[PDB]
UniProtKB/Swiss-Prot annotation, chains A, B:
Coiled coil: none
Biological classification of the source: Bacteria, Bacillati, Bacillota, Bacilli, Lactobacillales
Subcellular location: Fimbrium
Organism of this sequence: Streptococcus pyogenes
Described purpose of this protein according to its UniProt entry: Component of the pilus tip. Can bind covalently, via its two reactive thioester bonds, to molecular targets from host cell surface and can thus mediate adhesion of the streptococcal pili to host cells. Lysine side chains or a carbohydrate with a free amine group might be candidates for Cpa binding. In vitro, can covalently bind to spermidine, but it is unlikely that spermidine is the natural target of Cpa.
Post-translational modification: Proteolytically processed and assembled in pili through a transpeptidation reaction catalyzed by a sortase, which leads to a covalent link between Cpa and a major pilin subunit.
Location in chain, cross-link Isoglutamyl cysteine thioester (Cys-Gln): C50-Q199
Subunit structure: Monomer.
Leader sequence segment: none
Protein name, entry field: Pilus tip adhesin Cpa
Length: 207, 207
């Protein structure tokens, strides 16, 4: 069921939470999976991804604690204002993030995520997002998800697909060579956390 | 007061927690400070620093949830086994971390932390630790702590001392070219979290 929580914070009406919680299919509290969502007073849930690695993850949906968010335009200016270490040397941060969301979970318009289990696909997408929003270190994708392999007990098939999908998502030249490019109507939103101790969120949708 | 919590997990007797909680002097729940500690059944608290930026921070001391830890030798092999993205290029990972702990808060053996307020000194040390444990991006220290400046309301004096200390701590040349070198009896310990969803910890002491 979709949560219906009304904000107690002026200008922060969006409820941001982790849906990988009790009630989620195959949920385990020992697994490092996440499934971040944003919704407004029990409305349609939007797939969300976090940024600010040194801040707290949004609380699980069954927690007594709730985090409130303000929806902003997903511009470069708003990322510079809210991100700790954005990868802005390519100068198309916003565009890179939009391309990842368009090609990642669940949109997957060019089939980069094909064969990857939903929670593993979210994990790949999130890692590609962190590469841009927090300048997270990714040198060799062939060596990626080593901790996740032991923590989540990923089989060789899933692990190889995940490594290849991450490689493709963080390479702009690779994404730009694909048949389906990001249209003007597919737009980025930044969700600013009311509580500065919690991570900010980001989401994309067709307008 | 020093917490006294007994583990129920075989081989994980250490209690690891964030002491920056209700009751700590000048505590604010809106500040991004941390003061991580490890202790054994109410014994002396040891200053701890976290790693694994994508995992959960240890819970605050006043939480119903407790995280349990196994004390391991602070070797390069144990870092490769538990860290997501360690900065191993120079093969001196363990020595680099030891040098940071020896020179950082509270040890400060070469006075690098002089004039920096305790929570700010922990913050500088933690950021220097993350640079090695998680390959966190630090290009120009002159620009460091921009989000912390607004979130923690740091004055110009503290901010300048913090930026200079970070620069010195992450430069292997600098620290090795200091009058006091890390002695053989100052040893590194890795605290392995029983719950794989939580950050691992690290601490150093004189043996
Ligand atoms: Cl967290």
């Amino acid at each position: 069921s979709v949560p219906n929580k009304q904000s107690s914070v002026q200008d922060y009406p969006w409820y941001g939470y982790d849906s990988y919680s009790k009630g989620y299919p195959d949920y385990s509290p020992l697994k490092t999976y996440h499934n971040l969502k944003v919704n407004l007073d029990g409305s349609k849930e939007y797939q969300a991804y976090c940024f600010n690695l040194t801040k707290h993850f949004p609380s699980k949906s069954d927690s007594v604690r709730s985090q409130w968010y303000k929806k902003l335009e997903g511009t470069n200016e708003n990322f510079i204002k809210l991100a700790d270490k954005p990868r802005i040397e390519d100068g198309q941060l916003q565009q890179n993030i939009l391309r990842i969301l368009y090609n990642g979970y669940p949109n997957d318009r060019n089939g980069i995520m094909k064969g990857i289990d939903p929670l593993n696909a979210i994990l790949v997408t999130q890692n590609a997002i962190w590469y841009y929003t927090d300048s997270s270190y990714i040198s060799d994708t062939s060596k990626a998800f080593q901790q996740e392999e032991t923590d989540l007990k990923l089989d060789s098939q899933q692990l190889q697909l995940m490594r290849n999908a991450l490689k493709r998502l963080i390479n702009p030249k690779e994404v730009e060579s694909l048949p389906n490019q990001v249209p003007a109507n597919y737009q980025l939103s930044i969700f600013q956390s009311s509580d500065k101790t919690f991570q900010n969120l980001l989401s994309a949708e067709y307008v």
